[PDB]
Amino acid sequence: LSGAVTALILVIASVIIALVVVGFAFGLFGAFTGQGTVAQVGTATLSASTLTLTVTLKNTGASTQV
Amino acid sequence: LSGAVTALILVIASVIIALVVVGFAFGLFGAFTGQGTVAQVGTATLSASTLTLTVTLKNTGASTQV
């Protein structure tokens, strides 16, 4: 009688664990998609007297830092 | 299951990198176009007593130095 009890306990535990793993995978998807993609969309201007960089940047992801 | 996760991670990384490269290429275009083109538009006069050069220059790019 213990065999079937063990079988169902393991079945439900395995289902819980598999659902956890799948949720983590889809979270990884959503997190890597919106991670932050920064590129340049036009020439920069480097003032050499004051050493100041004026650059136009395009960022279609999360708000990152420099 | 890890295979598809790796595939999407690499796909998004590759897209970000390719966009960076393309932005850099177009920035190079814009930068080399307006780099500064200086030529002469008339005869110069070289005063030999004072050694002074009076020259008419045409510059259709960035403000350079001599």
Side-chain angles (χ1 to χ4, degrees):
Chain A
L1 183 50
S2 42
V5 171
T6 297
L8 183 141
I9 292 187
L10 294 188
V11 162
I12 291 174
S14 172
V15 164
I16 298 182
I17 292 173
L19 288 180
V20 159
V21 166
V22 166
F24 178 55
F26 281 106
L28 283 183
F29 268 22
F32 269 102
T33 300
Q35 69 166 310
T37 81
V38 182
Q40 191 192 9
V41 286
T43 70
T45 290
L46 183 58
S47 173
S49 66
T50 65
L51 198 45
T52 286
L53 180 61
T54 295
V55 59
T56 303
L57 286 175
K58 153 179 74 179
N59 166 27
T60 73
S63 177
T64 81
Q65 299 259 287
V66 184
Chain B
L1 175 55
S2 43
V5 170
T6 296
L8 183 141
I9 287 188
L10 291 187
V11 158
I12 290 174
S14 168
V15 165
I16 297 184
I17 291 193
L19 289 181
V20 162
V21 159
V22 171
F24 176 60
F26 280 99
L28 276 180
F29 268 19
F32 269 97
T33 290
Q35 62 166 311
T37 71
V38 187
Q40 192 192 11
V41 288
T43 73
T45 298
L46 182 42
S47 161
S49 67
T50 67
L51 199 48
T52 287
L53 174 56
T54 298
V55 58
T56 311
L57 285 171
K58 156 181 77 172
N59 182 6
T60 61
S63 177
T64 77
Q65 301 288 268
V66 178

